[PDB]
Amino acid sequence: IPADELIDNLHSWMRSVHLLHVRSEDNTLRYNWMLGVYARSTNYTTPVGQLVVNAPAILNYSNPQDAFNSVFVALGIDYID
Amino acid sequence: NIAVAHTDHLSVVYATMSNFMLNFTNNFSGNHATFKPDQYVITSPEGSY
Amino acid sequence: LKKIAESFEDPSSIVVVLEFILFALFFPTEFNRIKGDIQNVLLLFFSRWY
Amino acid sequence: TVTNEFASRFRTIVATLANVVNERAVQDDMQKATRSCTKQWLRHLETQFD
Amino acid sequence: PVEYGIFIQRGATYTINAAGEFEFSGRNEKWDQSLYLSEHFPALFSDVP
Numbered sequence A: 001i002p003a004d005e006l007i008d009n010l011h012s013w014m015r016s017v018h019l020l021h022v023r024s025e026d027n028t029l030r031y032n033w034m035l036g037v038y039a040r041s042t043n044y045t046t047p048v049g050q051l052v053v054n055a056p057a058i059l060n061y062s063n064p065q066d067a068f069n070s071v072f073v074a075l076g077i078d079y080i081d
Numbered sequence B: 001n002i003a004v005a006h007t008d009h010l011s012v013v014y015a016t017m018s019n020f021m022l023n024f025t026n027n028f029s030g031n032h033a034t035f036k037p038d039q040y041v042i043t044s045p046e047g048s049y
Numbered sequence C: 001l002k003k004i005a006e007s008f009e010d011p012s013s014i015v016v017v018l019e020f021i022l023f024a025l026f027f028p029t030e031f032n033r034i035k036g037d038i039q040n041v042l043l044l045f046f047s048r049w050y
Numbered sequence D: 001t002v003t004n005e006f007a008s009r010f011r012t013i014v015a016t017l018a019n020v021v022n023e024r025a026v027q028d029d030m031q032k033a034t035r036s037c038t039k040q041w042l043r044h045l046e047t048q049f050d
Numbered sequence E: 001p002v003e004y005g006i007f008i009q010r011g012a013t014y015t016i017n018a019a020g021e022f023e024f025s026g027r028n029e030k031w032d033q034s035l036y037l038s039e040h041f042p043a044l045f046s047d048v049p
Helices: A005-017 A033-042 A048-055 A066-073 B012-017 C009-026 C045-049 D005-021 D044-050
Strands: E013-016 E021-024
Touching: A033 A066, C009 C045, C009 D005, C045 E013, D005 D044
Parallel strands: none
Antiparallel strands: E013 E021
């Protein structure tokens, strides 16, 4: 492998990765990566990913656990895998 | 062969049009990248527009 | 109320929530008794919709 | 003389209930076209009310 | 096909942020006429290389 190919080539891919989000003002908010980028994988086909399409602001949590709690009450689902 | 007429004849019948009465809007098309027309809604204090 | 099953899917489903508005105006009493059962089918609009 | 506040109260409902429909971000195409052709019902109905 | 998925990757449409360059939406929507007189442009017409 050229140590020059993958350094230029890996960039070409990483460049083209965009994950839906909302820009916030409050300083006490942390974006939820893990679950959020999972939706971008399937293609927003699944409801747990079709829920994040409509209102992307569901991923802005200020306290852990409360992040997931919301993605349950608004689904009636008992567990995401 | 069309290039001759479509340049110095079918282009005079256009330059005239933009001067007519009853024609009052700007359908500017140069640069598609950034052009939106204008909304001119007739609003009322009550009711809908 | 004669209950309805409608998952609020498209923007054209606002024709159900608007019906519960107009019913709550021409008959404000007679809407008190059924306010809870009409609330049960209204929570789907506040969950799935937004 | 020519006010009728009950008719205007409904006009306010139609006004604020329009934004909920004119905001619902749909993930489709014709389901976005049905989002536009709904105001030709949302506004027509409010005139019939007055 | 080999590089179409690199185009439709960044977005099908876009908007313009207040004073500045374009803003491509990471979504892959189909186009419709209802969008025309409102917001968003068909991104297959913007010019950012």
